[PDB]
Design a binder for these strands. Structure first.
Lengths: 20, 74, 73, 340, 76, 71, 74, 74, 341, 20, 76, 72
DNA sequence: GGAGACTAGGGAGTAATCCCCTTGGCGGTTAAAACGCGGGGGACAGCGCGTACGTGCGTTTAAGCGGTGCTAGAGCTGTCTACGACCAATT
DNA sequence: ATTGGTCGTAGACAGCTCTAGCACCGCTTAAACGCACGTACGCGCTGTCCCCCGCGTTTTAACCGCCAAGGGGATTACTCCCTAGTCTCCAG
């Protein structure tokens, strides 16, 4: 079955912003 | 073989319903005449079929609505 | 207008359809069937001709309508 | 925040295609409408429970549609409900099953699946997008067609109306964006190359992009670099300022909350706006000022997502998938930010 | 749902296959999908004929009515 | 071909809402069953050979639905 | 000399639609030949039907009856 | 779906081959286009049908000569 | 006169539809062409024997036609042979099987059975009558059509060209005659009520009427008053001067001898008289200009309906064709009809 | 079969023309 | 000009007739019309099959040819 | 019934059909071809006869039928 | 292996099924008229056509070699050679 | 009655099919290119309007006989509603 992974409010680094 | 101009202004009036100022070329006019005549002959033939099926010589609308429900009309 | 589907014209078209005996109420339920299916077919026909950026319907639209209604001829 | 997934089939185990909240709502309870293959449009009553978790209450069933329904839209005033689908009939439902709805005008003229509908700010103008390669402008009061935009060459899966009422943003399946000036009634801009967007391999039937509520910026999903979401501006629509990378599956939906939030930067104005982006199996939550997303929810639906919707106050964020199940995102009092 | 036994359907499928050409393996998922489409179509024409008989003002059915429906479809 | 059992036909009929059924129903029901079976398998193998495959697949029957218009 | 207007890759991809994989180059010329002879055939009847409506301009309806004569209506 | 300008050149050239002082409709021209398309593709499925019976993949003219003689249009 | 019946099948027992003599002939031997269901046009050599009976000699076979041929026509100069039929193609044969013929120009544009063809006096302009409800004017030198007459509403089974080159006479199955001025290219006259002619029940595929060789009068067969053959004039084409009574079967063919005979009730008043032949379904009546009653009548010579008749260049031969696959000839001795001018 | 009846040149009255 | 034994043909077509409708009287003209249609279509079909077999390079003829031709014809 | 056509008759008609070497199973698919062909023709003949109210099938009925499917 | 189902089978009974008015709505009849067919400007305003534009992905040559047409030799089989019996067939 | 039409047997080998053999010209890029496609737009022009008049064939109304849709009732016929072995599909 699926194993839920939930991340709370951290004020993820794999999705860091990339600019051009 | 419906009479030409009564049918053509049937088509014209029922085309004006969607929006006015619609021009139809005679080519498409006889095309839609072909379409209507083909449909009507087919439906009339199937009505005769289901009528002799109904074991009555005279035609009845119930045959018509039957054909509609089988032909997916409603 | 709508009564343009002439009564003896209905008679002769029924003749070509092989009809034997004809009653009155057919003479306007035929008007109903004609008007509703033409509404449908000229509906998708005007849509098809709108795809062509064309302000006039074509026999091409009509024949595609017949394919969509399953009476290709 | 909290995320609650609806585990009861809304439309009898058939895929859900659209969701929309009543823009006319002004309190705590919001009215949500759904579209499914069951040819029925279900309006639900959504309100927070005592614990804050979302609770869904069934209100009405709209079975007038003969075939499947792909998009359901509420007016900005919430009065009229727009619904079209496989039968390609745009119904203008009105409040006349806990409640009842009746169609006002029949905005026919489309051929098959109608995927995206956007209401104009005045509510008297409609933008219609369907597989038929065309965009049709209608008059709500007249109920008749007034303009035609059929320059699209593929499945028109996304359209939005400019809040400023100047342009028309359309996304088609041909990886080409088309901008239509509202006064000229012709194409204003054409951008296809930085391809930029995803090809037919993207499995979502929708390419729903939406303008920023102020109209200054345009957010377009289903892009390529890899899958990403490009950002455009009114100043220049021929070059994106930046793109939000979404590795994994392609983004398919862009929805912005109609509530303006105070600043706690893509665009430089004293207010920030929080918008929701739905991919095939993940949702990323961004804001105007912060480039990185401040929220991310995934692994909650077993199939591809279809539509998302913000509530009138921004307290509800509905999520719909293609597995027949839906989900909601619940924020506490002004968790997103301080409203203006 | 399913009301037709899998094995008779599969064995007639194999019969027609070996009539046409041997070594044509049939997968369970495709077999069941084709079978359910089969049941759907047959029941569809079945209540089609049922309504036909309803017009025929005779509650009992006789297949010549079904053959009328056939030539309505124009299958043969 | 005999595998389509007549009591199965009768219970499917009972689902179909009929009340009294003539006996000779079964043979013509089976016949028009197999004619469409043949049409669908023909379209299936037509797509399959273009796909250079030998095994039936659900995509084939989906395309059969599309072609005959029963989707 | 527009007959050569039907090209190698076009015929090759029509072949792809046709249901072939490998076709020799020696078939392109016979393809243009069969095309030209049967467009001759069809357009003869087309222009006859066009003249029947006192028309100096051909219509799309003409090719319909042309295929009906040829037995390939569409 | 095949191409437009060379086929318009073809139809115009054969038209002047028949008779000058004639006009064509755009819609009629494209209609002729898909008509010829359908006829040629059907011939080519016949081609494939023969070649498969010819138990060879690649095609030589005798296939299409059969196509024509067998149906006997010429 | 003498009548000789051809009891040998010309086209392998298939029905014969047309006959035509070489108008270019100027001596005793005449060249005759036949058309049949066998898709072949056979030109024969016809000449009187020692006893005066007609003798038929086969010359050439013309099988270019893919389908049956209904009408065959020679040029007034005899150079070019016109042949069209079921395949609806008009072939202009020319002398390039005792002999050989080759088609010069392909005058296509017709749709189905072509029933009547008429040669203009100059030989450069063509009138073609076919089932397709139209008559097309062609250019022989150009080989291309130039005019169209679509006023026919039924099967066009008869047409002729005015020798004066002013009008065109057409007969169609609709019991309606249509006259087309060669200058205006429009309908000049139209007569349908005196019905005026016979309906579709008449069993001949042809309604071949021909003008008088001088063009003054028009002889229209298959009329109804009983079957009759009405006569018109250039002065008034909307009213018949007289009609020739032919009770029984309907007249179907009218042919006039191209030789002007001296005068020996009168239909027309000029110092010369013209002998013409009218063929009904099973009877042939021979009239002249001056006498109301016919001076010749031959019947019970063919087992089925007659199809076409043809006069020779000198008038010494009158070929008759029927639908039973057999033909016949009428032989007149030296100036038996009359003294030529 | 048919019985041929041939009438020679007599310089019949059943076909006498009637004028109008 | 016929070779099929004419009265066996008559009995064949008659027995087909009473398979559908009983007591159908046929005359010589109808029987010969059915004949002429018969030999005409069969000789055309064999002309077809022989030329196709010539394309097949094989002297012998086997019904893959006739099936080929009919799948050309559109009759199925 | 269908066996009204004999195998030697099939062989001789094939022989003047231009064929020299023949297999057996042709004698049976030819019967199927013949019945498939004739069913449509006889059905159209029945339709035309009912249109004309003539119980007996006539030559012209068959001829006009053959014209309808186009092999007059 | 073992448990639902089906196949084989009486009962009558409700469901088709054919007969008998039976009348009322329908099949031809008549008079004319009323729209049905048509044609002719009128050029006004609708329509396509050619070509220019550009520019870009379809079109053209070719390596190149190897998957596919082409040839040899089986080689083993189902006709068609002759026929001896039945055997339907015309009268 | 006989009389030609047919049928079924025996095997020689002619030839369809299978395997082995062979070469050669469709894929497969890489690069040149070109016309294909898209709009304007002036120029051509074709379809046309639509009225009435011409005029004329068909439409419509009404009659009157009468054919048939349906009712009534007697008539048979066919799935109950288990009864029971079975048999085999599917689970263990």
């Amino acid at each position: 079955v699926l194993q839920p992974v939930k991340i709370g409010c951290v004020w993820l680094q794999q999705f860091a912003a990339c600019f051009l | 073989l419906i009479r030409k101009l009564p049918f053509q202004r049937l088509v014209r009036e029922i085309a004006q319903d969607f929006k006015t100022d619609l021009r139809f070329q005679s080519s498409a006019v006889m095309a839609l005449q072909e379409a209507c005549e083909a449909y009507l002959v087919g439906l009339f033939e199937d009505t005769n079929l289901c009528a002799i099926h109904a074991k009555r010589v005279t035609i009845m609308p119930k045959d018509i609505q039957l054909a509609r429900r089988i032909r997916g009309e409603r | 207008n709508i009564q343009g589907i002439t009564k003896p014209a209905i008679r002769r078209l029924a003749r070509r359809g092989g009809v034997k005996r004809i009653s009155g109420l057919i003479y306007e339920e035929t008007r109903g069937v004609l008007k509703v299916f033409l509404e449908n077919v000229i509906r998708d026909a005007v849509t098809y001709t709108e795809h062509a950026k064309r302000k006039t319907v074509t026999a091409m639209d009509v024949v595609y309508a017949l394919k969509r209604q399953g009476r290709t001829l | 925040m909290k995320v609650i997934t609806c585990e009861i089939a809304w439309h009898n185990k058939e895929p859900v295609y659209s969701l929309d909240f009543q823009h006319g709502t002004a309190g705590r309870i919001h009215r949500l409408a759904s579209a499914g293959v069951d040819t029925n449009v279900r309006i639900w009553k959504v309100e927070k429970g005592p614990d804050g978790k979302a609770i869904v209450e069934f209100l009405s069933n709209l079975a007038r549609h003969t075939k499947a329904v792909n998009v359901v839209r509420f007016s900005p005033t919430g009065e009229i409900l727009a619904s079209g689908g496989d039968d390609a009939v745009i119904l203008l439902w009105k409040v006349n099953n806990k409640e009842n709805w009746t169609v006002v005008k029949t905005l026919r003229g489309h051929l098959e699946d109608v995927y995206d509908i956007c209401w104009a700010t005045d509510g008297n103008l409609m933008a219609s997008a369907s597989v038929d390669n065309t965009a049709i402008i209608w008059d709500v009061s007249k109920g008749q067609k007034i303009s035609i935009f059929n320059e699209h060459k593929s499945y028109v899966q996304g359209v939005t109306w400019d809040p400023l009422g100047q342009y028309v943003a359309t996304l088609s399946c041909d990886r080409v964006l088309r901008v239509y000036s509202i006064q000229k009634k012709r194409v204003a801009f054409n951008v296809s190359k930085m391809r930029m967007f995803h090809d037919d391999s993207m499995k979502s039937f929708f390419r729903r992009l939406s303008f920023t509520p102020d109209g200054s910026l345009l957010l377009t999903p289903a892009g390529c670099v890899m899958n990403t979401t490009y950002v455009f501006s009114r100043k220049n629509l021929k070059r994106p300022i930046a793109h939000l990378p979404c590795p994994g599956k392609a983004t398919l939906a862009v929805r912005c909350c109609p509530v303006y939030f105070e600043l706690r930067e893509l665009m430089s104005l004293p207010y920030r706006l929080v918008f929701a982006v739905a991919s095939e199996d993940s949702v990323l939550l961004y804001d105007t000022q912060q480039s990185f997303p401040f929220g991310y929810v995934s692994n909650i639906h077993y199939h591809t997502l279809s539509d998302i919707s913000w509530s009138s106050d921004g307290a509800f964020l509905a999520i719909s998938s293609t597995d027949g199940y839906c989900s909601f995102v619940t924020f506490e009092k002004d968790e997103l930010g301080i409203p203006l």
